[PDB]
């Protein structure tokens, strides 16, 4: 008798409990130390390398541990793996599906992930002695588009989905060992912590959910956003993460604090963020917006350190190396501007 | 060392560049066609009559030596606000709309809202929409026998008349054509709200017979690329 | 309506799991943030200007 309404009321009461518990630990803010840390300034970043070989719009990219090779997929069914040092297309895999939305370079530099509206993840191997590259594994267990995916190691890879079910696939068996159910809107992106024990996922429900890959449950949730979280990026320290959404506000959340730290918003920005990535130190934040320009923001001063020229179309994908050597921004103009 | 392995890498990069410049011709010559609908709107009958030839996601064909690419989305979820942003390089968004599915639910208004969102989209603003008023045979008997009437979900239909560009056919009632053109102009009323010139709508009436519907798509994409190049050269 | 009941049950279970967690102060969170920044500031190639010789892209 009256179970649905009482359950909704209990959920609202628990949400208010989470809210005022976050407020109880919100006795300060990150802006209270603005007089201690010095800013960076208007640092002019120039395009060092430009990978002008893509045909369709570069939708997703991901760097490697060696900070040398970078993957990038386009809607023409192509996925090119470039050597950013010499601007050379080391690999070019013609994907079985034209429209693809995700990219993931394995930390070992052997496996490469793709996928899109085809509901499948195509894992390819690069170090094969057979010569040319072929489809090493096909993952077909999702009922929604694969927005993003990230490799934990050469064995398992965690992929987002369009049906609110992130799946931790295993390349050995090709079957979902766990499932990260609990999201309300389709997951748009996800990122992995340096320790790889836990990973965060930003969805369109304006609530980034941080799960663990060992037990498969929902560790933390962050509902401080206002629109679809188009991209997410874990802090290099592993205790925080930035979220870029469509509301033109990049929100920095913390795992232990379970709340937001800063909102890198601006009145001169009406378009939403498409990609977010931290630097090596995490002080800098590369945010690819929808205004055809990528903004370097400060994670402490809460202001845009600078804006980058170049792309004339929407910058969709963004990737900073593991050592923070050179950030690569790939827009919808088949261009990959490798900044520095 | 410095060039012992970098030379082979440069040769491989040159081979990849040759492959990509060879694929560029067949890619740019290929005009993709995004096909979607509000639900059971007859898109199956559209993709079935395509060149007379892991589920059913994408089907390809070629007419007049022009290979197209029709991607069906009859398996993704109802939320289209994210993956449709991938269709900004597509040449046309074939909107297969069932003009008779308004009885079962008011799916016609949902299709109208979907078309409005596709039109006012920041990324689909430069992409034309091939409007396909599917299920025309099931609409004539509906508007004639009184089983399904437009005025239940549209008040403007009482204040609307058939324009001077009507296309009568043998065995058709003037009221059927009036309702069809009213739905067409209601779809066209959103096409002129923005009027940015970068994209235009193209209404069509299919599913009445099982004839070659690919001609109505080929001759449509022809004018699509025509007006695209005209707006690009400012001769429009 | 059973599907909505199950969804609400999963939601309230997730909320209960979120309730009994150890939340540190946001001041210590910002302190850890700035500590990691100042520890990796002089080593970040993006933060400080990297010379052309030591940079493999110039």
């Amino acid at each position: 008798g009256s179970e649905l309404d009482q359950l909704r009321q209990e959920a609202e009461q628990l949400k208010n409990q989470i809210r005022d518990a976050r407020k109880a630990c919100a006795d300060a803010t990150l802006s209270q130390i603005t007089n201690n840390i010095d800013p960076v300034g208007r640092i002019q970043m120039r395009t060092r390398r430009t990978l002008r070989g893509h045909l369709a719009k570069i939708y997703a990219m991901h760097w490697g541990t060696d900070s040398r090779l970078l993957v990038s997929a386009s809607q023409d069914g192509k996925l090119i793996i470039w050597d950013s040092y010499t601007t050379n297309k080391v690999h070019a895999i013609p994907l079985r599906s034209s429209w693809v939305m995700t990219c993931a370079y394995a930390p070992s530099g052997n496996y490469v992930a793709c996928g899109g509206l085809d509901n499948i993840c195509s894992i390819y191997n690069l170090k094969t002695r057979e010569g040319n590259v072929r489809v090493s594994r096909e993952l077909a267990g999702h009922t929604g588009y694969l927005s993003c995916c990230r490799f934990l190691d050469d064995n398992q890879i965690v992929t987002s989905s369009g049906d609110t079910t992130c799946a931790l696939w295993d390349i050995e068996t090709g079957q979902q060992t766990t499932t990260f159910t609990g999201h309300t809107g389709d997951v748009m992106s996800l990122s992995l912590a340096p320790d790889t024990r836990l990973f965060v996922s930003g969805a369109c429900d304006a609530s980034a959910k941080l799960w663990d890959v060992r037990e498969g449950m929902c560790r933390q949730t962050f509902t401080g956003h206002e629109s679809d979280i188009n991209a997410i990026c874990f802090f290099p320290n592993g205790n925080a993460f930035a979220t870029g959404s469509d509301d033109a506000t990049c929100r920095l959340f913390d795992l232990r604090a379970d709340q937001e730290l800063m909102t890198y918003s601006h009145d001169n920005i009406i378009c939403g963020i498409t990609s977010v990535s931290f630097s090596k130190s995490g002080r800098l934040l590369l945010a690819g917006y929808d205004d055809f320009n990528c903004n370097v923001w400060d994670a402490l001063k809460a202001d845009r350190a600078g804006v980058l020229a170049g792309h004339d179309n929407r910058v969709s994908c963004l990737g900073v190396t593991d050592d923070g050597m050179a950030v690569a921004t790939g827009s919808w103009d088949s261009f990959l501007k490798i900044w520095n | 060392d410095q060039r012992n392995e970098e030379k082979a890498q440069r040769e491989a990069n040159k081979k990849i560049e040759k492959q990509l410049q060879k694929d560029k011709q067949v890619y740019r010559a290929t005009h993709r066609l995004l096909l979607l609908g509000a639900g059971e709107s007859g898109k199956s009958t559209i993709v079935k009559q395509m060149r007379i030839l892991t589920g059913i996601f994408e089907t390809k064909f070629q007419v007049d030596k022009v290979n197209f690419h029709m991607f069906d989305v009859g398996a993704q979820r109802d939320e289209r606000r994210k993956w449709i942003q991938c269709f900004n390089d597509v040449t046309a968004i074939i909107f297969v709309v069932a003009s008779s599915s308004y009885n079962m639910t008011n799916r016609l208004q949902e299709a109208l809202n979907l078309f409005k969102s596709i039109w006012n989209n920041r990324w689909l603003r430069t992409i034309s929409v091939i409007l396909f008023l599917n299920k025309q045979d099931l609409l004539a008997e509906k508007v004639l026998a009184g089983k399904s009437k437009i005025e239940d979900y549209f008040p403007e239909f009482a204040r609307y008349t058939t324009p001077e560009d009507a296309t009568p056919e043998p065995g058709e009632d003037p009221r059927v054509t009036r309702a069809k053109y009213f739905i067409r102009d209601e779809f066209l009323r959103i096409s002129t709200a923005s009027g940015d010139g970068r994209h235009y709508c193209y209404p069509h009436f299919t599913c009445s017979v099982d004839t070659e519907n690919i001609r109505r798509v080929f001759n449509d994409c022809r004018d699509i690329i025509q007006r695209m190049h005209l707006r690009q050269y400012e001769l429009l | 309506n059973t599907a909505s009941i199950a969804q609400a049950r999963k939601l309230v279970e997730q909320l209960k799991m979120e309730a009994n967690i150890d939340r540190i102060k946001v001041s210590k969170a910002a302190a850890d943030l700035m500590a990691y920044c100042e520890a990796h500031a002089k080593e970040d190639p993006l933060l400080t200007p990297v010379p052309a010789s030591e940079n493999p892209f110039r």
Partner: nanobody
Amino acid sequence: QVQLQESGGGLVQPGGSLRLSCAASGFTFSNYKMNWVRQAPGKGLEWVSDISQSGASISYTGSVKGRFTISRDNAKNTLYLQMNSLKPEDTAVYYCARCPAPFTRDCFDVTSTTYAYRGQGTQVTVSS
């Protein structure tokens, strides 16, 4: 938390008047295209009406065009929807949803249940 509480609703006589007040907290209400969508018991959701970021491009569905009235107030972050001349078909669960994209005119909130920004809705019941 993006929360939308729609106060109002209840038993309605056919042809009367009703007012729902949707208070949306957790975001900048003066920047999105809020919209009311109804769902009839046994049928899918039906888009009712939407309003611009300021209130310029107001549009309704063909079933309520001329009867309903949607108005946004930014000083209180509220959305007021007035139903006039109720009909036995207008009885449904109403949801005050928000489409995520700001500074825009497109919205994809006509989908089915389990939406990102959509309240529990009010069961507007038309009596006899």
